[PDB]
Amino acid sequence: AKVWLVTGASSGFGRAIAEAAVAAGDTVIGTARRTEALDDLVAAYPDRAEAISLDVTDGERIDVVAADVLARYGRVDVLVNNAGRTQVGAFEETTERELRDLFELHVFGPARLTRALLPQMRERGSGSVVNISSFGGQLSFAGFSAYSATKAALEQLSEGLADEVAPFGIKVLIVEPGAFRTNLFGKGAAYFSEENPAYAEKVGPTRQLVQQPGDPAKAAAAIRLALDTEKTPLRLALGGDAVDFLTGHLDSVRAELTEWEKVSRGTD
Amino acid sequence: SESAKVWLVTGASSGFGRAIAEAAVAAGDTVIGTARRTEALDDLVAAYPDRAEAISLDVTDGERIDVVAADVLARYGRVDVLVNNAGRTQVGAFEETTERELRDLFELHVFGPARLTRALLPQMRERGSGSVVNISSFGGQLSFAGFSAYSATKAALEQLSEGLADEVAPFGIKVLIVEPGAFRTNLFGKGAAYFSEENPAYAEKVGPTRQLVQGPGDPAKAAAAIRLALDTEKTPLRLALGGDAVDFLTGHLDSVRAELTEWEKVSRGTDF
Amino acid sequence: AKVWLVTGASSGFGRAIAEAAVAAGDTVIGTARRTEALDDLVAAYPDRAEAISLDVTDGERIDVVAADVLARYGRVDVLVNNAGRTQVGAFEETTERELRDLFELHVFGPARLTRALLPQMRERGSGSVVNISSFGGQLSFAGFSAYSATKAALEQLSEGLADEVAPFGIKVLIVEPGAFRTNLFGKGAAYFSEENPAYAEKVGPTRQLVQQPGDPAKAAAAIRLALDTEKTPLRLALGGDAVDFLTGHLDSVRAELTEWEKVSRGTDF
Amino acid sequence: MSESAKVWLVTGASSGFGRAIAEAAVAAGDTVIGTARRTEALDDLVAAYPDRAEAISLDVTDGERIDVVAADVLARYGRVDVLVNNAGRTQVGAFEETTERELRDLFELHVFGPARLTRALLPQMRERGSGSVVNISSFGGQLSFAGFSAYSATKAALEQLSEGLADEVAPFGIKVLIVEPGAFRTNLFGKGAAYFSEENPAYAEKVGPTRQLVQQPGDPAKAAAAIRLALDTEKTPLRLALGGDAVDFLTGHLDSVRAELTEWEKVSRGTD
Amino acid sequence: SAKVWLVTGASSGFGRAIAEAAVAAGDTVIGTARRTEALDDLVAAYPDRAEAISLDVTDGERIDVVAADVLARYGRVDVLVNNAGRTQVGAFEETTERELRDLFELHVFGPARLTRALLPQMRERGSGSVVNISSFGGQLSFAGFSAYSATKAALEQLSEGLADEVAPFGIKVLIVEPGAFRTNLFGKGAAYFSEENPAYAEKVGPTRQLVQGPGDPAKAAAAIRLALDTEKTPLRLALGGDAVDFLTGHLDSVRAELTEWEKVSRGTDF
Amino acid sequence: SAKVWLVTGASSGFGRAIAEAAVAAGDTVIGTARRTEALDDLVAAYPDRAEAISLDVTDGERIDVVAADVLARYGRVDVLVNNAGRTQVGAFEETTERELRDLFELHVFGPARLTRALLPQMRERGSGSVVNISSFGGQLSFAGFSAYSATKAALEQLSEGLADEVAPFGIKVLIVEPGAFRTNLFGKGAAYFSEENPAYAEKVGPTRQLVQGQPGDPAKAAAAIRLALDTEKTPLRLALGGDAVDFLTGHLDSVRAELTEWEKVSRGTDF
Amino acid sequence: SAKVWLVTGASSGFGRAIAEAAVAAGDTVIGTARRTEALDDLVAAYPDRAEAISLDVTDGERIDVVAADVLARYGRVDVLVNNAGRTQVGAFEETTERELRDLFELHVFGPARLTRALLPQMRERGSGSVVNISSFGGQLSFAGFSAYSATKAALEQLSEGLADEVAPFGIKVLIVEPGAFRTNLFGKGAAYFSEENPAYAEKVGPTRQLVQSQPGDPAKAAAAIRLALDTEKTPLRLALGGDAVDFLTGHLDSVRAELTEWEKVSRGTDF
Ligand code: NA
Ligand code: NA
Ligand code: NA
């Protein structure tokens, strides 16, 4: 029986991941902004699920919650960083406040929480850190700059960490979903900047993209499968759409590198 | 007669930025180089007293970014090429990196450059020409032991750059992500570097990264390649510089591709 | 020759109103968070259109903008409070911050601008205050509580003011649009709270409503028609969808009042 | 507690309509928590009903104190069946005379306070699958006139919060009632605080009459019995008008809004 | 007879070797680090003789708390080793006041406060050792080393003055002046390098290389223990040939210059 | 040509003597003191070539303002002399953290900030002098003198590293190491002596006696400084007084002796 | 029945002498000092009748805590001795405001605060002594001694007013006016010297030398204080040492002569 701590557990992937752990017999602590958002999970598993109030934006609260969960449970086996939100807007339209906020949620908060729980994993010689990224963690396009920037920062913190904690048997999994249904599991908040005529043609489609094919329950099962495989992948894309964006981007980056390779190598 | 292109280079007092600034002035461009202390740039201004100016700028200071950007526009009328170069080397285990260290690196490498770019974008747009050159690293696409914070900042800068490029292409604005390896520090000097304490839990992994970051590129050749990239009809999104950068980038591309391929069945199976 | 000040002129309905004013021969000051969005308008009418930077969440900047306009233009004849955003969230899912932020854009901001520009209208004995509301200014439903609350506040500020300034010859018009096409004038900002499964059945359809038939240029022309009438209507609904929502809500309020009237009147001494 | 008894939480319970509601609840065998700024105001009711009535100090303006008081009641009583958001102030003055401070203060009392308190008690109502939220509005919740703009703006906001919430929470068996009284007799129950702005010459003719009106009186005891009838009816009305004045005002305004919509309908519909 | 060692900055490099030597010889060690977790490996290896305590030596109030707590639970500290610090390289002109103050905090003020906290109980016993980890740079400087040398020399002179005062109490004061040690077993300490501008690159470049990298830190830790086990403990213990050479060069040059100018020096009498 | 001297702590001791020697030699002097009135005599004697400016060297803000004002109005500073300071004697355990920090502010942080403020214009011109008033205590210590010596040594080492860095720009760095000087004609800085209990009296007592008092003439010290600055190779250090010379030699001898004593153990750590 | 003595500045000199004489007389002593180290031997030698408490009399909050702590644990204080302080020399013009304020904190405000905290329990009991260690300087001054004299004189007059008020309660107030005492046995108190200004050197120099062997025996001084307190009519003032007696009679002679000379003028100003 593993102890799971899942941030943003009241909606989307977080909720589906939290439900799948309790269903498998694990012990889950789900965090959300409002404890009561997880009232149904807790009332159905009074013994193995707990809801805690946590704003991933609040560093002080992160330290309190990490310490309280460690104190009362003795350990965290799996950390899942799922707290977050959707944001679409032109680079120029994104305010510094909106940019800093998204980084608090997707980067600084998850890093602080991860840092708080890493030592007991290292000391035990086992544990998993599961970071909910996006295909956006490797690529961007019109309207997605702030979002991709935050997810790519998360991804590179994960890559670095993974290399460091492999010796301790710690698994780091970067999950890269595409679009998933929201009727059954809900979703996190979403903000869409004013579209000004200069950007509408480019940014407009990204608004549609973010505003169907994916099953959150099947996603959570694939995450558990990847964690339970001998060699856990560093990244797990989820959805045909995510896969398509990722391969197309790998393709164009390699093409450009080869094209400019002689120039690149000539600066030696 | 033609108006000379106006280059604004941040962290232009040493290293790669000083090579880029030098390249611009020797080619006839007008250069505003920035540094925390203007006196850091005395040698540049002494050499090019008519075409080079030194302005005091801490890229961690958002109010000052806005003041400098507005001041440069007021006196030069425009900025043709913005080079976001300011920054530092940083090495430490993820567990060893303090929140303050992580935040300070994001200020320098992400928030400051984002603010400066937003301030200068509108005049590029209204003119219908301009270049934003963001100095990244092979670490803007990949990471390893001791490099987590650095790679995180550069990847954020790269993704801001990818999004922006897609949005401003219709305006004729060029966005260039530069991904160098290590350069010789002979004439131009070196940028600041911080190395976290290495404890025995991480030393075997983090140790080599410290060495990698400490020390053979030619910064002048690198600076020429940037200018070539900017002068070409199809300006690439990325320009890696140096053999090690290319090797690192190719190895990461391969590893990512191989992993995607292996896991593709599972990835595609999550639909209804 | 009238001086129009239009907030949120950057996109959607605000752009259309400002565009209609200049096409009519008036002088326009359009405000937005960023001036760069209004550049083509200023380019087309360089002597009669100006773009000013204004976040209506910032009380100090409202005061500065208002004073600057009155100094350089001498007056404001028509004030249009249009700045704002669409918002969707279950009541319980709305954080206090999401609630207060919407009240800044739709209520406190407009109230402050209006107070600052009211004295000069009152001294001149003419002026119009045009408050961009919604069918939501009179009614609400799942997912729409915060939005409706802000717009209803704005409508009732407008009702009380209208009665107060009528003797000064000042016009107050509450405009109640449905949804407009935004392929021409650009789409406004939109905020959506976290979605909870327990609420999805109800909030679902509202998200979809917000995320077509209205022509914003026709709406702008309707506003000016209403203003040009000697007895300006207090309210001007725009679009069949808005009229339908409003008549639906008026029907149900009326039926309820009738049903409970005996009990209601019975509570007096 | 008797098996059929209900827990009522009434804000602003020490005087006026809120006092009458609190008193009607105890008389009906219910258990009451009444709040006020000075708890000592409710001493005489607590002494008359030691085990079924409690006074708790609360400024609805104070959101931290809201959360504490709500948690306290739920801990100690186990539930709240009926919440009455009654705390409030009468306020009159010209739009132009009202300070931004006075406006924000009235929004805190009438809108943000109740919103937070409601939000805090809604989940125990949902889990139990029964409960009532009773919001004390005014005829002013649907209409305004000279001197009344701030007060109407706040009541209308509270009403629309209620309308939206009502639609969301009906599936859970939760009742949401908007009460719309006129002025009440004050001889037996007293009244709430009241502020009347300076009336300058330019507004005296319009605002004067509003001051008089706000200052045909309702019977608060019968008004409280009507709230209880409305809540006990299978189809609870969304709105309950109270008094001939409120009914006249509300029906007269619906009439005018409808007539105007009719007159302008061709113009309204023509915007496709 | 077991001794209680308190070693600041004990998790990596030289301090960790000093901690290792102590526990290997049967003494008790309290090692400090900004995070207790940095020391997990030492506590794992020596569960009964090593403890890790969180201490940021730039935090004076935390210094008082940690010293009192150690006394409360161990009853004494026999050997204090002021080891916490960092390497720092940069031109005098490029060094910010903040960077200068932070280095003084780590290398001077923190050590002074901690020493003060722990002296009374050594006086009371009539025994103890204060071991201050300096450098050849505690006696000399050169391009890029100004801030570093300044902090180490201050620590040295505090030490010289203290040694002369506490000798009658049976307290030993040892200034250790190491050169470059191998960092392959216990990791390396933190290091900050300033930007190196063209005006200073030729002079400061070689200093960056010198601190970036021939010495055995295990032998260095043994030499410290030997110097303390000796009836007459030297005031200074240079460690490494490189240290000896730097120190001799500076002695020679200071003496040559004193002599060259001596006639002028002596002619200022009233 | 005529040089511009900025002298901190100009109202007493070496600062006063150096300021008077500069103006007598035809140079221009800006002297600083906490109370400008302390420099009234200087300004009255040389109304056109001396100026008094108020400066507390513990106030970095004020340091910045004064440095900029002097550069703005004089156009340059040729010679910076750091003489601001005070004296303290007391057992290491008697010295409060506050007293310790205050000494470091006066002797180290203040002079460093002022030096950094004036270095670029020296570097740019290719000429200039930095004159730091240290002590034999900048190389050595003993009972009662720990705090003082620690601050002076910090200053010495900042000077060593700086001197090496700016030699290529022709800038002179001069560490002045005086012994005991008469104070009846030039005065001196404030002096504090901690409580001296019987347990420390035998060791600390002699140090109090030594700093309170005599042999040295500050006017002659000022001339020796100007002589060192005017010589082709300026020494990095200038001791002043036979007493300082004996202190410094004795310390060199014992440091060298102990190095040699333990040398085999030292070299034994090499792989 | 042994009395409870609270002695400030018990760490050296006179305060230590007084604390020791009290334990030797069989009394109970609480000695207070910024640092307690010097008192270790007294505490260990008399573990049941001597205690050392850390107290900086400049810190009013700490005065309050310590007064309260002693009253709660011992039940009372019979004899309060205000002895904390330092020596200080400087020309009036060379005395900075901070130097003047610091000396007033030590010699005036702290002692006033401690006395106030302990007076109620004396008043309620109907017995007690307040012993204030002044100086001949509490009545007179001369070059270099103005701050010291000003603080001691203020302490003396607080004492004169207090003595008159608390006489009817049976409380004794004793102003002790010592001259220079030997420091080789009991140790030496802190000493502060203002910046030296050459314009004052001839006047202030001799005073500096005055405070920098000494005739007085602190053990004999302690015995005389005890005798003064044991006497039914305790004198208001007790000079100690021939030097003190001579300074004081010199001052009384001059004040008396000047009063006489100007009496007619003085009395001529009546309405
Ligand atoms: Na480096
Ligand atoms: Na000073
Ligand atoms: Na003395």
XYZ file of N, CA and C and ligand atoms in Angstrom, chain B residues 89 191 193 195 213-214, chain E residues 193 208 212, ligand 1:
28
model
N 25.919 31.424 -15.182
C 26.033 29.996 -15.066
C 25.603 29.597 -13.665
N 31.328 35.353 -17.862
C 30.162 35.786 -17.110
C 30.214 35.204 -15.708
N 29.294 33.000 -12.370
C 28.909 31.588 -12.223
C 28.727 31.245 -10.735
N 28.122 27.942 -8.041
C 28.140 26.496 -7.880
C 27.709 26.154 -6.475
N 30.933 22.900 -17.212
C 30.567 24.299 -17.241
C 31.804 25.194 -17.054
N 32.885 24.623 -16.509
C 34.106 25.371 -16.186
C 35.197 25.304 -17.260
N 31.709 32.941 -8.607
C 32.637 33.676 -9.443
C 31.931 34.881 -10.046
N 40.669 32.323 -10.972
C 39.527 31.416 -11.143
C 40.029 29.995 -11.319
N 39.506 26.585 -8.983
C 38.744 25.555 -9.706
C 39.497 24.240 -9.850
Na 33.398 29.148 -14.088
